[PDB]
Amino acid sequence: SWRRLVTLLNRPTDPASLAVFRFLFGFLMVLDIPQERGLSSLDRKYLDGLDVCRFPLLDALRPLPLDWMYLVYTIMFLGALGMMLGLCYRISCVLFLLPYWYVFLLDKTSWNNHSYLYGLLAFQLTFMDANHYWSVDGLLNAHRRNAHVPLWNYAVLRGQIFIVYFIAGVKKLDSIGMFSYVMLASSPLFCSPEWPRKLVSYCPRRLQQLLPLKAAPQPSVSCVYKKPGLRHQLGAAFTLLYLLEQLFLPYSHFLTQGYNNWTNGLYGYSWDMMVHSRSHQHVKITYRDGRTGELGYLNPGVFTQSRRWKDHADMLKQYATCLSRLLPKYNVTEPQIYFDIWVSINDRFQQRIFDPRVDIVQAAWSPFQRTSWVQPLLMDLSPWRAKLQEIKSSLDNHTEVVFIADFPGLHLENFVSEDLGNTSIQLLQGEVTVELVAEQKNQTLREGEKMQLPAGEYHKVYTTSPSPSCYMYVYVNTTELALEQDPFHERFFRFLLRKLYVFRRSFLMTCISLRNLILGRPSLEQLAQEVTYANLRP
Ligand SMILES: *[C@@H]1O[C@H](CO)[C@@H](O[C@@H]2O[C@H](CO)[C@@H](O)[C@H](O)[C@H]2NC(C)=O)[C@H](O)[C@H]1NC(C)=O
Numbered sequence: 150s151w152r153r154l155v156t157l158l159n160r161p162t163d164p165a166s167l168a169v170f171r172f173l174f175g176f177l178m179v180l181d182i183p184q185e186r187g188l189s190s191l192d193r194k195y196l197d198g199l200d201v202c203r204f205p206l207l208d209a210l211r212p213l214p215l216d217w218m219y220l221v222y223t224i225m226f227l228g229a230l231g232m233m234l235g236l237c238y239r240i241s242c243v244l245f246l247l248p249y250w251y252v253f254l255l256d257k258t259s260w261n262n263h264s265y266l267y268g269l270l271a272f273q274l275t276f277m278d279a280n281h282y283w284s285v286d287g288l289l290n291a292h293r294r295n296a297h298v299p300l301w302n303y304a305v306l307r308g309q310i311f312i313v314y315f316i317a318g319v320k321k322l323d324s325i326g327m328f329s330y331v332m333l334a335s336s337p338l339f340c341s342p343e344w345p346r347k348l349v350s351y352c353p354r355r356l357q358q359l360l361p362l363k364a365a366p367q368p369s370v371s372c373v374y375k376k377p378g379l380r381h382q383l384g385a386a387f388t389l390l391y392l393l394e395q396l397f398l399p400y401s402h403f404l405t406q407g408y409n410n411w412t413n414g415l416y417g418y419s420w421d422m423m424v425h426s427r428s429h430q431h432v433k434i435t436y437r438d439g440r441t442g443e444l445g446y447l448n449p450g451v452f453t454q455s456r457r458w459k460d461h462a463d464m465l466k467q468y469a470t471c472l473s474r475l476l477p478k479y480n481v482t483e484p485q486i487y488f489d490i491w492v493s494i495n496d497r498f499q500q501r502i503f504d505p506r507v508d509i510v511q512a513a514w515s516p517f518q519r520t521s522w523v524q525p526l527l528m529d530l531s532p533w534r535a536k537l538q539e540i541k542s543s544l545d546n547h548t549e550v551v552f553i554a555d556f557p558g559l560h561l562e563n564f565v566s567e568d569l570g571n572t573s574i575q576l577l578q579g580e581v582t583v584e585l586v587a588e589q590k591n592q593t594l595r596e597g598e599k600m601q602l603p604a605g606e607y608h609k610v611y612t613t614s615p616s617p618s619c620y621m622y623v624y625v626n627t628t629e630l631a632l633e634q635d636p637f638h639e640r641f642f643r644f645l646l647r648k649l650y651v652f653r654r655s656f657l658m659t660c661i662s663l664r665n666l667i668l669g670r671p672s673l674e675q676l677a678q679e680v681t682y683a684n685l686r687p
Pocket residue numbers: 558559560582584585586589590591609611612613
């Protein structure tokens with residue numbers, strides 16, 4: 150039944166094994182905020198007046214100024230200090246939740262599969278009665294001291310670490326930070342909740358006085374004892390209706406079709422490590438100048454701080470709309486920015502990921518509709534990616550080859566160097582014409598046809614086929630071949646002095662930038678002595 154279900158989920162359980170996990174997550178979010186969340190490096194990241202192209206999830210999330218942004222990581226650290234102790238716990242979770250999902254939703258490049266877990270585990274632990282055992286609220290309130298907690302404090306937490314352990318096994322069918330310690334600290338949730346009363350019995354008698362209470366736990370208000378109420382019934386709409394989306398959001402890719410791509414899509418909730426096989430031999434930002442039509446080949450990573458905008462279609466459009474307002478400061482009024490990104494596969498198969506003729510500033514991208522201007526990965530060329538081993542094994546060590554796949558209307562202007570003598574082409578699928586601009590002659594190639602190329606010149610290979618044409622570049626470095634023819638006990642001490650710079654610089658710079666709100670701004674020559682005070686090694 151439904152009334153029988155909520156009586157099961159609100160059954161009084163022991164509050165102790167939740168309260169170790171409240172501590173060991175609240176303590177591992179004390180070590181985390183200096184190291185990984187970037188309190189050591191907010192100054193170079195959210196600097197005042199600096200033109201940086203952000204990548205937030207919602208585009209209305211504009212980051213605060215750096216005077217205020219050191220307060221947001223302080224409320225996060227005041228929140229993760231009361232969630233450590235268990236102090237003022239329904240406020241110290243909301244002071245850790247709301248400035249985490251403002252920080253974590255502010256940088257799409259900062260998403261991964263462990264810093265999304267802490268944004269989940271701080272959302273469950275906000276609604277949970279974790280401060281019943283071993284708290285300060287227990288040492289200030291009697292009815293929050295060693296009192297029985299409902300089972301949905303344990304059923305959700307056993308169901309969240311189940312799904313992370315389950316979907317990461319199912320996603321295998323196709324320097325990680327604190328993740329190696331939280332999943333070791335979360336493993337005492339799957340044990341019986343009597344385990345923090347077992348090791349204190351193995352402890353001596355005099356050590357039992359600073360350790361918390363050992364007796365049998367009292368009943369509480371928040372349970373159903375052998376009909377439930379409004380607090381009790383919403384623990385059954387949070388046990389399942391939260392765990393339903395946690396079984397659904399890793400497979401919510403086909404509804405967020407503006408985000409998803411060839412391999413992963415929007416990284417974060419996937420639970421599977423991303424592959425580094427791309428290696429990206431090209432980017433070419435090509436903007437049209439306003440009102441003149443002139444061409445500017447812009448530098449690739451000018452107004453960004455990460456290289457995640459090239460592998461994904463969502464971060465490109467936000468980078469193409471942030472560049473659409475910055476470039477008027479450099480005499481480019483209305484830019485028409487066309488990206489030409491050659492995503493390379495592990496050793497071969499170089500092909501574009503975005504359409505280089507379309508204006509990414511104006512072209513429509515909706516988060517649930519299909520993205521139009523993404524070129525598809527040629528998965529018909531994945532049996533040709535097995536055909537590479539036919540060509541690789543038949544050829545020797547000194548003939549190196551990369552493969553190219555090209556779409557209609559496009560061309561690859563490549564410069565063969567002086568080192569790459571005896572360089573040939575083989576057009577496999579489709580029809581392309583190779584034109585040497587030094588020789589000014591077109592030559593239409595046929596399927597399987599072999600043709601050499603001159604060294605030290607440019608060449609343009611235009612696609613005239615209506616199908617995606619593909620070809621390969623056998624090359625030999627003839628000048629390189631003519632060159633061939635002629636302690637642990639002190640590492641951790643070095644690791645300790647590294648991390649004590651992180652704790653010192655993050656603590657010192659926070660109090661400097663908190664002075665500007667309460668005590669106003671100092672002089673520029675005053676703070677110059679203050680900022681180099683922190684950057685030194687202690
Ligand atoms: C070789 O022939 C191709 C096919 O006509 C030429 O490519 C076209 O060039 C014109 C003018 O430059 C462009 O307007 C077309 O868009 C091009 N076609 C495609 C499919 O891009 C190419 O210019 C010729 N080679 C040289 C060196 O001139």
